[PDB]
Design a protein around this ligand. Structure first.
Ligand SMILES: CC(C)(COP(=O)(O)OP(=O)(O)OC[C@H]1O[C@@H](n2cnc3c(N)ncnc32)[C@H](O)[C@@H]1OP(=O)(O)O)[C@@H](O)C(=O)NCCC(=O)NCCS
Ligand SMILES: CC(C)(COP(=O)(O)OP(=O)(O)OC[C@H]1O[C@@H](n2cnc3c(N)ncnc32)[C@H](O)[C@@H]1OP(=O)(O)O)[C@@H](O)C(=O)NCCC(=O)NCCS
Ligand SMILES: CC(C)(COP(=O)(O)OP(=O)(O)OC[C@H]1O[C@@H](n2cnc3c(N)ncnc32)[C@H](O)[C@@H]1OP(=O)(O)O)[C@@H](O)C(=O)NCCC(=O)NCCS
Ligand SMILES: CC(C)(COP(=O)(O)OP(=O)(O)OC[C@H]1O[C@@H](n2cnc3c(N)ncnc32)[C@H](O)[C@@H]1OP(=O)(O)O)[C@@H](O)C(=O)NCCC(=O)NCCS
Ligand SMILES: CC(C)(COP(=O)(O)OP(=O)(O)OC[C@H]1O[C@@H](n2cnc3c(N)ncnc32)[C@H](O)[C@@H]1OP(=O)(O)O)[C@@H](O)C(=O)NCCC(=O)NCCS
Ligand SMILES: CC(C)(COP(=O)(O)OP(=O)(O)OC[C@H]1O[C@@H](n2cnc3c(N)ncnc32)[C@H](O)[C@@H]1OP(=O)(O)O)[C@@H](O)C(=O)NCCC(=O)NCCS
Lengths: 236, 235, 233, 235, 236, 233
């Protein structure tokens, strides 16, 4: 439930603020003063994507309209907090992905642009896409397709092309590019783990549960449950 | 030509603001309220490079002085919008590169630093270079020589060394380093460099050559050739 | 000495402000108005990590708390300045690393998180760790151990894991990752641009890792590892 | 009625933005991009009351909650634009009071604090009262009762005590104090108070009375009368 | 000359910065890095009138266009710095009125709105008029007529009506209102000194070199060289 | 005691933050995260006097320099808090003056300028004097002498001249001017709203000045002066 992840987050925030006086204001502003995940998420995103030309107050108006028109966007977020939570040894707090992980922020921001790109509000989608790249150093074309339970660990330098597909429970590290030389982008299936720096190019298939070596340059489809590594990548 | 690009850009901004109420203010303050490309660009770049210590208002004075001093800088920008637009079917509006692409922004901010360095105003050149690296995550030394018709698509992690040169119509993708092992690469016109490529040393990359993603280029590459691999060999 | 490096910085800032009118304000605010490196460094760092939710005035309180508690943090900063200075003919001024190099800023910022982490103030360490990623495009777990004379040249995309150890005088370029399949990089080493060093493995003193290498096996002292996967070359 | 005022306001903003390129962004972000009076007002008031500690984004949440909770607040605002517009020939646009008059802003910010005080959220009421005093230089205690059709022309230095009441269609000018020597004034409808006037004590100021500039009112004033002087006598 | 007042100001700034390290940045930003009075004045005004909706960068664009279209506006400023300079015992520095006096800033800002009101750019004039009131607590209707050598000492609460006239070398203190009950506003002649809190109402004449008591309520014309005081004011 | 008033403030802030979710952040930033009144006061003041040219982080350095040099400045602040508290049934919390009353902020800000003025750092005193006018609509020359237990209620439009002297426990309302045709206001006095006291003249202990009065002649102890011009009434 969005309300159960939200419950853990609220309870954690209360504690964390009691233990860290220098951060209490922060916990109250992002979480404790909000009523639900969307309120906290939109407050967080408006502030992070904010700039001199489009202030946090104006960015938030945009994000809230999107959450109001399609509430499931928020649900995708709760599913994303959960995934990083146990697909990451160290992340034990539910509030950690929500508050600090730029890959998480990048994905949730992207979901906003995707909804917008589907409403044919492309100028708005392109504006956000690029502010997402400036703030988080993640560039996902609004038209790309991405499922839930997604993890962009560290995230710096991740580039996802216009025709890319990313299924559920995929994990992507820093420096990964999904791109090409119509469909000229990868179709990364369920559960795939992509190592740091890997460049996946072409309308090729990366089968469910496959693993990609760090720095690979994958050009040929990768079988399900297989490991692809090397430049160019071979099944290993 | 500036006037045509600018006019196309202006006509676009009008229709776009008309169709997207939420961005109307953005279109008006970045483009519509300005009279020429120079004013729109210096407005955007100052705001994107601004920080608490050097606010947009103060950085705009620097940018303006450079534009008033060397007007051809704005030209190179006009040529870059042109390239990006055509050389990337995806981009289908004159105003997109101006408004949204950080690679484009980083190059134009760079042309400003290059001028400052050529005028012996290095502390200013250095400050900007690094603010450019913070904003757009593109680090181009000010003494690097770069032509026009340049495309830094995505751009994250690009690093260009001090003695590098980049001729016209070159396209560079994310994570590309032009650096050392004169100690940096010389990229001739029409070269396409793939994502992640590391090109090391004062070596020649011939015109219209293609560099594969993640390659590590150590020896010269032949014009029209294709280099891929770690080390890069010809394929 | 922190007082030595500081004197050099003040002499330079005074002339730099003299020669560039449009930047004099900047030199006075970061350097000349302060009385020591700690004051300049905390001001610079608070301002760069600042955001709408936690402004510079608030972040500085945190950094100053740390510097007051452990003054040696500032000493490591003075040591890292020389390194980027001597280890790089491309940088000649003492104040250049302090003022403009994001890799340097990311390292000094990390040192603050590392101290907090060790005081068990982990939420503050995590908050900063991630603001460091946003501001400088560098992600170093506060638990990582990093000695001094460190140089993060260009820095973009550098990622260092929770159990990584980086000894003295190491240099690390853009796109470098130290983590798991975390690394132990001995003194004087380095990790060339785009290289990924993965696994509980050791990189010997003065070894060299080649651009875009993928290191999975230990690397010998003074050895040059390169390739995907890395091979002694 | 809100819908007519709002629609008039919107039609005005369109033409104005059309005629003044430099303010087009302002008109779009304050009015044009919003769907109702509530959104435009909460946007303006949050931005005008914002400070480094409580940014516009955070103050807007408070304002929104109050508007969603007690919708009639926005109404009183609509009635105040109406008054000002007509009761001051100088003002000749529905949008001017909304956009430019700080007296109008201070009253609407006040209605928010009054609601918060009535909901026993005093620390919030107190915070705003004082931020209102900083922004607009108008200090209205939150427990003061104020009707609609109110005009605070110029408004600088206005101070309204805790037990004050102000009925409909009252106009108050700069430097006016409604305070003590229940300990504050009761201003009936239609009263016009001149600049600098100090009205002290729980005394009645009858409907449609006129108070001269710089007067000091200590005894009750008769309806339709005119009080002027220090002390004020009837003239 | 605008260039001589500017010369004193520049030289003073250089010294003042050398003597006050904690303010050096300020002296460099407002004065020393600028080439002329207009550059320094517009930088100062854009920053002071700035707000979340219209940032200093955008306000400055407006002010610079005005100075470019009518450079004499700047000259009026130099004449104003001079007047406060010796019509005020304590003010010995030329840079003091320029940098710190809100009445001075208020007047110079007003001159911008007056030029704009004459170009029929009323929405812009009204916007500035009111931001001037918010920042400096001075409200001068753009249509009012005001000469040079003007001093708004302290300035808080000064209100100047739409049809008011203020001639050269007039001095006005805090709390002064020029207003009314067509011409329904005062015509304050050359050299008049108006005490704090005085309310001058009606299309009445205040003769050159007259003096107005603090807190007066002037309703009848005041003779040249005379003193008016009281509520209502009498010639005394 | 500053420690007494501080304890009261912390107890209140803790409950206030408890009862109002939308303001908890504010209470933690101004009060709870700090360890004493000086920390809270400088944070509050730096933030209110901040502007694009001199941000809060920069103004705080100046205030802290002053508080470090003359800790007693903070003691006068604690004393002024009680005054607004006891001298006003409309204010009941110790933290209300510290948090929300601009007259109080203007007074404490002035004290900083007064100290600088006396250290001969007049440009800094003048800069602040005028930022105080912009932020709080109060203009007090740094050279003015003002004792403690001072209450500037509502404050708007208050103007105090260079040679003015205000002793202890005085209360001054909005629109008040102390200057020349500067005043000497003895202990416990006051100056009602809109009153203008002009000339090198004396206002006696516990005297009362009526709203909009124009005082030109000395006023006797316990006397009530009112009128334009003021007359003993
Ligand atoms: C490929 C990977 C996923 C492990 O998968 P695996 O199925 O266990 O593969 P193995 O370890 O069995 O090794 C099989 C072959 O792959 C090679 N190999 C492993 N990783 C490689 C890489 N990144 N590039 C190229 N070759 C690689 C091995 O040397 C081995 O070769 P061999 O058959 O000649 O002996 C892993 O090595 C990797 O690259 N992980 C990236 C994780 C990462 O980026 N972490 C950073 C954390 S911040
Ligand atoms: C090299 C490249 C430019 C295509 O060039 P090309 O002229 O078509 O050369 P080819 O595609 O015919 O490839 C020839 C050989 O190189 C190999 N190769 C291709 N790209 C390679 C790369 N990046 N690294 C290593 N080998 C590569 C192929 O497997 C092929 O092998 P073969 O010997 O069996 O014939 C391209 O594949 C590439 O690397 N593009 C990067 C673009 C990018 O980064 N896009 C991201 C967009 S966000
Ligand atoms: C490791 C390094 C620092 C110096 O290496 P070295 O000890 O001098 O080794 P050499 O230069 O003699 O090269 C030896 C072999 O390595 C190969 N090699 C070198 N760098 C390589 C790389 N990155 N990937 C793959 N092979 C590489 C050479 O082709 C040579 O091949 P050989 O066995 O056929 O003789 C350097 O080669 C390198 O990669 N530097 C990157 C620095 C960088 O990132 N700069 C960016 C500045 S922004
Ligand atoms: C009193 C006032 C409202 C007019 O009311 P009115 O009904 O016309 O009363 P009158 O004008 O006939 O004045 C009658 C007497 O009051 C006196 N008077 C008028 N205004 C006075 C004032 N503010 N204080 C003292 N006496 C005043 C007149 O001199 C006149 O004297 P008389 O006995 O010789 O006949 C008006 O003069 C006034 O004070 N207006 C203030 C408006 C203001 O502040 N405007 C600023 C706009 S920014
Ligand atoms: C009126 C003023 C300008 C002096 O002018 P002046 O021509 O010298 O007038 P005089 O002092 O000779 O006094 C003449 C009469 O005016 C009266 N008077 C003076 N100031 C008065 C005032 N503000 N209100 C009413 N009556 C006043 C005197 O009591 C005297 O009356 P008398 O003939 O019955 O004895 C002066 O008193 C004043 O009000 N100055 C204001 C300056 C100010 O606001 N300073 C604040 C600095 S921040
Ligand atoms: C002075 C003051 C504090 C108390 O005065 P007091 O000692 O009780 O004097 P009194 O109330 O007995 O009044 C005595 C005479 O003064 C007159 N008077 C009082 N205040 C006056 C004023 N401001 N102007 C002119 N005359 C005044 C009375 O009408 C009375 O006249 P009388 O001689 O015919 O008997 C008070 O009258 C006053 O003006 N307070 C203003 C407080 C304020 O500004 N509050 C605003 C809260 S935001």
């Amino acid at each position: 439930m969005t309300l159960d992840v939200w419950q853990h987050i609220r309870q954690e925030a209360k504690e964390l603020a009691e233990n860290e006086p220098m951060l209490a204001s922060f916990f109250h502003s992002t979480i404790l003063k909000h009523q639900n995940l969307g309120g906290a998420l939109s407050y967080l995103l408006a502030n992070k994507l904010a700039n001199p030309i489009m202030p946090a107050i104006s960015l938030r108006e945009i994000i809230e309209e999107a959450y109001q028109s399609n509430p499931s966007i928020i649900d995708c977020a709760a599913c994303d907090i959960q995934a990083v939570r146990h697909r990451d040894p160290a992340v034990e707090l539910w509030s950690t992905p929500l508050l600090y992980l730029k890959g998480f922020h990048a994905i949730q921001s992207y979901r906003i642009t995707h909804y917008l790109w589907n409403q044919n509000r492309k100028s708005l989608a392109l504006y956000l896409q690029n502010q997402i790249s400036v703030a988080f150093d993640v560039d996902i074309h609004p038209a790309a397709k991405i499922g839930h339970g997604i993890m962009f660990d560290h995230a710096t330098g991740i580039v996802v092309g216009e025709t890319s597909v990313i299924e559920n429970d995929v994990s992507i590290l820093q420096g990964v590019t999904l791109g090409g030389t119509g469909d000229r982008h990868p179709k990364v299936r369920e559960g795939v783990m992509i190592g740091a720096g890997a460049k996946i190019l072409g309308n090729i298939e990366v089968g469910k549960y496959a693993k990609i070596g760090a720095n690979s340059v994958v050009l040929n489809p990768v079988p399900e449950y297989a490991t692809a590594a090397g430049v160019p990548a071979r099944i290993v």
